[PDB]
Amino acid sequence: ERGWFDILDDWLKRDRFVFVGWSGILLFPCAYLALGGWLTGTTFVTSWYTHGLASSYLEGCNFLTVAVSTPANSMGHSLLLLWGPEAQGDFTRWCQLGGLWTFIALHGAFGLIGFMLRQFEIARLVGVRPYNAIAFSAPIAVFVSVFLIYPLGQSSWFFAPSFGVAAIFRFLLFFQGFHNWTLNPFHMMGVAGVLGGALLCAIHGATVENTLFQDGEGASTFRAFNPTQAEETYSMVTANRFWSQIFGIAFSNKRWLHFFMLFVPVTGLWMSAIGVVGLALNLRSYDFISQEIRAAEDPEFETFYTKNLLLNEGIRAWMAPQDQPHENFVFPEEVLPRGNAL
Amino acid sequence: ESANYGYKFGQEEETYNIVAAHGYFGRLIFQYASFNNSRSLHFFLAAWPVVGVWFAALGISTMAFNLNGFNFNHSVIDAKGNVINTWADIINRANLGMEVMHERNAHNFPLDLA
Amino acid sequence: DIDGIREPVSGSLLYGNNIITGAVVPSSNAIGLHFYPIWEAASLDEWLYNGGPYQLI
Amino acid sequence: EPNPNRQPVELNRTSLYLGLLLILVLALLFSSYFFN
Amino acid sequence: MEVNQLGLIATALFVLVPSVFLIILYVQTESQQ
């Protein structure tokens, strides 16, 4: 059978400068709209009616302070379709109400699906194992847990991260003050995966570059490599001895080494995603009960754990009225927690 | 069997096909965004995190001399002069809460100068 | 007494800490950047109160 | 009735060392929260 | 300190059961030919 389906299959899988594929039907419109919507909003769209914030180049913000901000807390978890009951088909109101945030978040979610389908699709055509697609499950798990599940656990989209540099910084600080997120062992595992992943990246690249075989005469050693050569370009044997003597242990299996490099950052991102799923419900690792019982009764007992809660209590009281305007928090000066003099 | 037994410590021949990996990754993006030279690929793997962590170390090292992050507190002002808050000002609110609570009994004078 | 204000902070496991809250606590703000080896203290008990171990480590 | 699908299982020494390290480190991490 | 008393056996079984799993597997690998 050479019907229209097979003909179309042929055209979609042409070997062109940018491969398309079936996955491209989903990937390219959703990736393009997500990006264009972020650029559109950070250039032209305000956050005045949802947050009380200027947030675009047009208003005078810079690259660090522009954002596409979340909708107002009164929208709840509304999809905020352009043709939905809130905007009623009006493009201007839709922008003022935060419609671009769901637009970006949802087209982004389907774009990421499209990208992972592309890794599967190209891997099947070229004949390689799909481990690159499997490793990409971690960024998807992070995006989905932070930008979708977390706000769905909370009161509204308002508390999801806003799409901007300084907006994300505020999200980090909100999570310290309200969730004590540095204390969470699922975040701790994510940090170990990210920092150990960076460590592995540097140390593997440095080791290869410093155990090279002399395969040419030039002082620039890059030229002495041919993609089709059969031999290894650096000495695993020398690399293994050096690290055994420097550090005690070393890799000896090159397949295990590169699987391990896949494993460490991927696993860490998955662990952090599980912690955030907890924070969707305020299921925090906020306190150690034993510390609190001792500290309540013994005003001489002090640890870095009790020191940090005092910091979180400052963050909450000092940022909440501005950060949560729909709540109408009025905190008189006399109630604000403050140390001496400051 | 584990695929790791397909590599033998000290064997002369490479254990994977870098032309296949380039052929895959080149099509994921485009051909000239992918490395075909293992030496320059591994140099890049070394350089990116090392250079980045150098700058992080230089951040702490230069903020040690109080050359601090960008300050955009009240940078946006309306026609009358009202402050129009940005996300930078929200960050400032959180920083203030940390400032006033930290070392709560250690300051007697209004400015924390070190 | 990390901040030099006679307000000692507990860092060790035997004095009420777990793995997550425990620390070796920095030396006293009263010492500043002065060098504080064991032999500049009148006793080990002084050295420990003032955070001597942090400098040594 | 000898079932033909049986296979021997292995765990090499390196895998034992890695597995013990994971378990002990995970326990060192989570124990504080178990005690609370 | 008023810790949760179950923490002891929870930590002990967390270490012991999976470590024992690996030790069984390793030792019967060695005893193989």
Partner: peptide
Amino acid sequence: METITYVFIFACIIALFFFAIFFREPPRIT
């Protein structure tokens, strides 16, 4: 008991380092 538990686990890890380094599988070239 918590303190004993924490130090015990730490002590096992240090013992693990010793065996992993000095009683490792020797790497063999083939």
